Amino acid sequence: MLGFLSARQTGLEDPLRLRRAESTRRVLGLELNKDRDVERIHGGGINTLDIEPVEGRYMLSGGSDGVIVLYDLENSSRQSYYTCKAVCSIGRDHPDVHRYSVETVQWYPHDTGMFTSSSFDKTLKVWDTNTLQTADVFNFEETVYSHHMSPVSTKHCLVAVGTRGPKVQLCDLKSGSCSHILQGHRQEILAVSWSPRYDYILATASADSRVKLWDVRRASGCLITLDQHNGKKSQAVESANTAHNGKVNGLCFTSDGLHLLTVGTDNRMRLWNSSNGENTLVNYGKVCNNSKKGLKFTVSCGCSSEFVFVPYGSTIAVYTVYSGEQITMLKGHYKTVDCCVFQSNFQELYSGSRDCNILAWVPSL
Amino acid sequence: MKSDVKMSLSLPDKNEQVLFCRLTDEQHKVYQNFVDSKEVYRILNGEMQIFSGLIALRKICNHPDLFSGEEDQFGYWKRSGKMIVVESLLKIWHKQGQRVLLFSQSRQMLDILEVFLRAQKYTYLKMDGTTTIASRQPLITRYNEDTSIFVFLLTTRVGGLGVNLTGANRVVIYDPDWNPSTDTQARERAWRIGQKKQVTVYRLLTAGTIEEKIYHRQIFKQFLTNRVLKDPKQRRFFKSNDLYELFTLTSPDASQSTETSAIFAGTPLASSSLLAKMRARNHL
């Protein structure tokens, strides 16, 4: 590493080299945090986490008990040991608390003054973070499994919602229009994710073992349907062209948005060319998941090699996205891990699981 | 609309009136017998289709001879008040030298109006659904080119959309329809681009009858379309029960004003604009 510092000082290597190499080294040295703790307030398992995209300071967490906790991740104390204190809380005494489990919570991109939370109580609530009051509510005829706002859209502000209905809802936060729907799936839509690269590209994964990419501006259904075999087993499109041999319960675009990682209940993760949905045949081995709802997993950013952190039983499996090589198992949870969210500023990880714990993984040394 | 683009093209002024034509006493008796007969009672019980009762009352307000079935032949114009007003308007307009469009949704009452015009000495021309399509264009042309034809007979829904009837000056809609658009098209057909003289539309209604409620429904649908398409904020005109109950007869005695006039008695985002718009829409 002194070689890295010397090369940076002498201009031999771009500082990009040191930055991404050290980010990768930090991610590889991920371990149970020696001096850090997260305050425990959820009475039930944490189903979702979200660190705000700008300044990466505050973290939302939705629990199976319906409460939403807002934590400050910064060590505002002077000690090396600190607990991520809870700033705010939609608790059981809040007038607008979710009646059932909160399954997805997401900070509004471009601004930390608002966030959103969808629950199995058939509601997508939009909260003002300052007053901590519901600015809006969208009701659905069937329970919400996931939702996502575009991390890129300066123009549109649509929330793509996947419920147990076979339709992907698009709720306009600009003047409230939840009527827009996308047809083409056949069972519950367990995951939805906007492309970080393209403004109007949305990937939706449903229990019909299919993943569809939509240009929501378009009037002609999905753009691409992901196919495991890319055409080896080709059939007229009524039941073929499946992404997995089970329910596809998780989506994640890579950092650049040029590839898509789909995890399904066939104990398989697959990497897809996001421009034509071709399977890249990256192996990843066996990725154990049996979740009946959406599975939240994230990818690394700002590193020499991209990593993907997938909940794997009661562990976090870290894989290399483009080679599939298994990095490691982060092993500190006592029950199945529901979500993991990656802090890209310091290569940190926060994992929420059914054991009512949010565990922080920090690079060692 | 023709509000922003009006300055580019010309448009002669258009005036419109809704005449409220009292029922004749025989017509009034027939209407009251029908609204007291057991058929409308079964309609109110839901045991029979209300639609036949609607058609029957519309027939009664058009002319009793439709529903019931010298100076006593078929379709005598003295037995329906709307035909009295058509008598007066046709006579006055012929003395004025104008040219008339005579509209009616019913082709049977269109034929009754033809027989009435033959009983008078008005020259006229008829075009309806029974005329062959290949000979529709000549008739219109013959009406539009000369003045020796006085009144042209239509139903609101015959011909292609907007058949060019320009030589007409006055237009009378003999009976209202359920669709606002067919009556709007009826009045629009005379008053189009390249209309030389001021065109006025007279809608003929029978007050306190089914026809008044048909006109009320027509205005209500027009209001709904306008609210959806041009501006949501709109002064509310109607009552839910009065608008929907349409099997009664309260003919005015001129002591109290008509129902229509009683109803119309007065005449990237920076997450704060986004939040402001959300809370604004939600407080409403």
Explain the overall architecture.
The PDB classes it as transcription. Keywords: Transcription, DNA repair, ubiquitin, cryo-EM. This is part of a larger assembly, with chains A (365 residues) and B (284 residues). With 365 residues, chain A is mainly beta. Chain A has helices at 2-10, 15-28; strands at residues 30-32, 36-38, 46-51, 58-63, 68-72, 82-84, 86-90, 102-107, 114-119, 123-128, 133-139, 144-149, 158-163, 168-172, 181-182, 191-194, 201-206, 210-215, 222-225, 248-253, 259-264, 268-273, 298-299, 307-312, 315-320, 326-330, 337-343, 348-353, 358-363. Chain A has one domain. In chain B, strand 5 (170-173), helix 8 and strand 6 (199-205) form a beta-alpha-beta unit. Chain B has a 6-stranded parallel beta sheet, with helices on both faces. By secondary structure, chain B is α/β, with parallel strands linked by helices. Chain B has helices spanning 25-36, 38-45, 50-62, 64-68, 81-96, 107-119, 136-145, 180-190, 210-229, 240-244, 259-263, 273-283, and strands spanning 14-20, 100-103, 124-126, 151-154, 170-173, 199-205. Chain B is 45% helix and 10% strand. Chain B has 12 helices and 6 strands. Chains A and B meet through strand 11 of A and helix 12 of B.
Biggest interface and residues each = A-B, 18 and 12 residues
Structural class, judged by helices and strands of chain A?
A: mainly beta
Sketch the major β-sheet of chain A: 4 strands, antiparallel
Summarize the amount of helix of chain A as a percent range: under 10%
Taken as a percent bin, the fraction of beta residues of chain B is 5-15%
Helical stretch count of chain B?
A: 12
Describe the strand arrangement of the main beta sheet of chain B, using strand numbers.
Answer: 1-6-5-2-4-3
Domain module tally of chain A: 1
Main beta-sheet strand count, sense and barrel state of chain B: 6 strands, parallel
What is the CA-based Rg of chain A, rounded? 20 Å
Radius of gyration of chain B from CA coordinates:
22 Å
PDB class: transcription
Keywords: Transcription, DNA repair, ubiquitin, cryo-EM
Entry title: Pol II-CSB-CSA-DDB1-ELOF1
Chain A: DNA excision repair protein ERCC-8
